[PDB]
UniProtKB/Swiss-Prot annotation:
Included stretch of the parent chain: 63 to 136 of 145
GO CC terms in record: extracellular region; extracellular space; phagocytic vesicle lumen
Saposin B-type domain: residues covered: 1-74
Source organism: Homo sapiens (Human)
Expressed in which tissues: Expressed in natural killer and T-cells.
The name this protein goes by in its record: Granulysin
Disulfide bonds: 7-70, 34-45
Keyword Phosphoprotein applies: no
Chief place of localization: secreted
Biological processes per GO annotation: antimicrobial humoral immune response mediated by antimicrobial peptide; cellular defense response; defense response to bacterium; defense response to fungus; killing of cells of another organism
Length: 74
C-alpha cells in the first residue's frame, strides 16, 4: 500500500521542480527528486522510481492529475 502514497508525494514534488512538463524536463527532475530528504524517504523514493518512473513521467507529460497518474496503485 505504500506505493500509492509514494506516488502522490513524488508527483507533487516533480510538478514544482519543473516549469513546463515535457519528456526532458520531467525526466531530469526525476533523477533528482529522491536525493532530497532523510535516508528513509530517499530509499522509499528511489525504490519506487526504479519500478514506476515510466508511468510517472508519462502522466506528467500528459498533464494528468496526481490521482490519475497514480490510479493503478490505489
Amino acid at each position: 500500500g505504500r506505493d500509492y502514497r509514494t506516488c502522490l508525494t513524488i508527483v507533487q514534488k516533480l510538478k514544482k521542480m519543473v516549469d513546463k512538463p515535457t519528456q526532458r524536463s520531467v525526466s531530469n527532475a526525476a533523477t533528482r527528486v529522491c536525493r532530497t530528504g532523510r535516508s528513509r524517504w530517499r530509499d522509499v523514493c528511489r525504490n519506487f522510481m526504479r519500478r514506476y518512473q515510466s508511468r510517472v513521467i508519462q502522466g506528467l507529460v500528459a498533464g494528468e492529475t496526481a490521482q490519475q497518474i497514480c490510479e493503478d496503485l490505489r
